[PDB]
Design an enzyme around this catalytic site. Structure first.
Site, PDB file in Angstrom:
ATOM      1  N   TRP A  72       5.031  -9.802   0.721  1.00 27.72           N
ATOM      2  CA  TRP A  72       4.632  -8.465   1.141  1.00 27.72           C
ATOM      3  C   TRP A  72       3.113  -8.239   1.367  1.00 27.72           C
ATOM      4  CZ3 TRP A  72       6.332 -10.027  -3.455  1.00 27.72           C
ATOM      5  CH2 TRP A  72       5.944  -9.411  -4.641  1.00 27.72           C
ATOM      6  N   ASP A  73       2.385  -7.539   0.515  1.00 23.40           N
ATOM      7  CA  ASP A  73       0.926  -7.455   0.741  1.00 23.40           C
ATOM      8  C   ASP A  73       0.370  -8.805   1.151  1.00 23.40           C
ATOM      9  OD1 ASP A  73       1.638  -5.121  -0.512  1.00 23.40           O
ATOM     10  OD2 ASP A  73      -0.355  -4.896  -1.513  1.00 23.40           O
ATOM     11  N   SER A 163      -2.484  -7.008  -5.238  1.00 24.76           N
ATOM     12  CA  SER A 163      -3.187  -7.420  -4.031  1.00 24.76           C
ATOM     13  C   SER A 163      -4.680  -7.213  -4.100  1.00 24.76           C
ATOM     14  CB  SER A 163      -2.589  -6.781  -2.766  1.00 24.76           C
ATOM     15  OG  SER A 163      -3.253  -5.605  -2.472  1.00 24.76           O
ATOM     16  N   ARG A 246      -6.398  -0.299  -7.720  1.00 28.35           N
ATOM     17  CA  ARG A 246      -6.080  -1.600  -7.139  1.00 28.35           C
ATOM     18  C   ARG A 246      -6.680  -1.814  -5.762  1.00 28.35           C
ATOM     19  NH1 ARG A 246      -1.258   1.235  -7.548  1.00 28.35           N
ATOM     20  NH2 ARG A 246      -0.287   1.945  -5.584  1.00 28.35           N
ATOM     21  N   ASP A 247      -6.380  -2.978  -5.182  1.00 28.30           N
ATOM     22  CA  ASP A 247      -6.664  -3.318  -3.797  1.00 28.30           C
ATOM     23  C   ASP A 247      -8.158  -3.398  -3.501  1.00 28.30           C
ATOM     24  OD1 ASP A 247      -3.790  -1.602  -2.307  1.00 28.30           O
ATOM     25  OD2 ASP A 247      -3.967  -2.912  -3.988  1.00 28.30           O
ATOM     26  N   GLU A 339      -3.769   3.522  -0.267  1.00 23.10           N
ATOM     27  CA  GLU A 339      -3.711   2.139  -0.695  1.00 23.10           C
ATOM     28  C   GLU A 339      -4.395   1.270   0.285  1.00 23.10           C
ATOM     29  OE1 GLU A 339       0.962   2.162  -1.450  1.00 23.10           O
ATOM     30  OE2 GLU A 339      -0.398   1.192  -2.942  1.00 23.10           O
TER      31      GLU A 339
END
Length: 492
Positions: A72-73, A163, A246-247, A339
């Site tokens: 996915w990511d 991610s 995150r990210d 995100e």
């Protein structure tokens, strides 16, 4: 200036010091424009979105990247300017991976995610490669013990790798610094947290390698905590067990070599459920006949949605150490999830791209899953949401007039491609990669067709002449630069 709807907020686009404390607001006024331009005459399950902001339909019979791994990511190998580099003849992509054949269901893969990498030969047009991308799978990116070192001697039930980015530290060398989100969970028998989850933004340095056949890595044994939420600029777990953090995406200030920044998902600090949104988060222009009161918006529960896009700055050359800065963009009373923030340069302007979910929008604001966009004159700007002042850049085909459903339980009146893709990332040339979620009750743990958006000032349009009617072949994540390191090459 659309009948029955508020006017979008005014945004200057002016630059501010990145060290300053100015935060742009993706306001209600801004966001409400989405339903303002959503065609309310469409039939059940047809796309109500404006056609140039809609992503092309993905075919039901898509291929899979690999029959043995959920993917996915997905990001790739970039330099400090986000240019995408092949290394000694190979393209490489880094993915959140999970195991189809272990016990768990697609929707519960997250507490299991591991960063893996795929590769394939560089320098080749997509029309000349397998329908599924031709990506051979290299395995996990990190040695097996290593990401759990960050939580050594703490108690949890799950520890996963979420991610981030992979940065080519030496344009013609092999050092890569992987920034990622090292998460831990302490779930009870019903998957509820007895203890709030932990997300820590983490650096691990490692080296890439390649011979004639085959790509591989070394290092990634040292995992350095960079940032964790402080509960004053960025919401933490004690404050909200559902906090987002995150990210990480890093880049060198284009106008200032040496100084590095990072942009990442967050939430506006403070205790969950505090009803502290302001007239500024609403952002209506004075005396607008269609404005909402702060009291209405609050009463409706919108204060539960409190996304930001955060900023931080490296405190030296290694990118192993960082200081938080004020958030770049907040979306109080608009959306809980922004995100995968990235800053993106185009035509001497600064674009923040980030993705969101229809069901993380606040009450009375509505929009598709897909990519949302902001433009300004600097890293920290009074950002202007893209397209009609809305922020919407590219949504999945969605009927906004009917109920949303979910990627596991579709509503019958909604479109079967609402959840066709997520995790969109904007690559040089305005090329957008993403993963397939749900296409007509087919789950895809796999790369979606790469797609293209032309970006013009504060507006965008999906390129219907990219590849094949807008569809540019699955997993097409191409390198626009080449790292030819002869000396590490001969070191195989």
């Amino acid at each position: 200036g659309v009948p029955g709807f508020p006017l979008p907020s005014i945004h200057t686009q002016q630059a501010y010091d990145p060290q300053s404390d100015f935060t742009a607001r993706w306001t209600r006024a801004d966001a409400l424009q989405i339903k303002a331009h959503s065609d309310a005459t469409v039939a059940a399950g047809q796309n109500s979105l404006p056609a140039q902001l809609t992503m092309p339909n993905i075919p039901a019979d898509f291929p899979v990247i690999n029959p043995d791994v959920w993917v996915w990511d997905t990001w790739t190998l970039i330099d400090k300017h986000a240019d995408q580099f092949s290394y000694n003849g190979w393209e490489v992509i880094f993915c959140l991976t999970a195991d189809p054949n272990a016990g768990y269901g697609f929707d519960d893969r997250h507490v299991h995610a591991r960063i893996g990498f795929f590769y394939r030969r560089a320098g080749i047009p997509a029309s000349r490669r397998p329908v599924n991308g031709g990506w051979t799978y290299g395995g996990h990116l990190f040695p097996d013990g290593a990401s759990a070192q960050v939580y050594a001697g703490q108690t949890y039930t799950n520890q996963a790798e979420w991610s981030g980015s992979s940065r080519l530290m030496q344009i013609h060398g092999n050092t890569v610094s992987v920034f990622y989100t090292d998460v831990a969970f302490n779930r009870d028998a019903n998957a509820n947290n007895i203890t709030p989850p932990q997300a820590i933004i983490t650096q691990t340095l490692g080296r890439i390698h390649a011979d004639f056949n085959h790509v591989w890595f070394t290092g990634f044994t040292a995992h350095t905590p960079l940032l964790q939420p402080d509960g004053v600029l960025y919401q933490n777990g004690a404050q909200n067990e559902f906090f987002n953090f995150r990210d990480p995406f890093t880049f060198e200030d284009p106008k200032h070599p040496g100084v590095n920044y990072m942009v990442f998902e967050g939430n506006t600090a403070g205790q969950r459920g505090v009803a502290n949104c302001t007239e500024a988060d609403l952002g209506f222009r004075p005396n607008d006949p269609n404005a909402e009161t702060l009291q209405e918006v609050l009463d409706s529960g919108a204060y539960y949605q409190k996304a930001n896009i955060g900023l931080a700055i490296a405190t030296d050359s290694t990118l192993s150490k960082w200081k938080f800065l004020s958030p770049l963009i907040s979306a109080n009373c608009v959306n809980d999830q922004t995100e995968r923030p990235q800053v993106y340069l185009h035509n001497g302007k600064y674009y923040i791209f980030t993705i969101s979910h229809r069901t993380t929008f606040a009450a009375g604001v509505d929009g598709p899953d897909g990519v949302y966009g902001f433009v300004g004159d600097g890293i920290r700007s009074d950002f202007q949401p893209m397209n009609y002042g809305s922020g919407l850049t590219m949504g999945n085909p969605t009927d906004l007039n009917t109920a949303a459903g979910t990627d596991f339980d579709p509503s019958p009146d909604q479109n079967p491609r609402a959840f066709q893709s997520y995790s969109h990332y904007v690559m040089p040339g305005g090329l957008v990669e993403s993963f397939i979620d749900t296409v007509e009750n087919r789950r895809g743990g796999t790369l979606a067709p790469t797609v293209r958006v032309r970006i013009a000032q504060n507006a965008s349009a999906v390129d219907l002449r990219y590849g094949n009617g807008g569809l540019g072949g699955y997993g097409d994540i191409p390198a626009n630069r080449a790292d030819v390191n002869i000396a590490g090459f001969i070191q195989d």
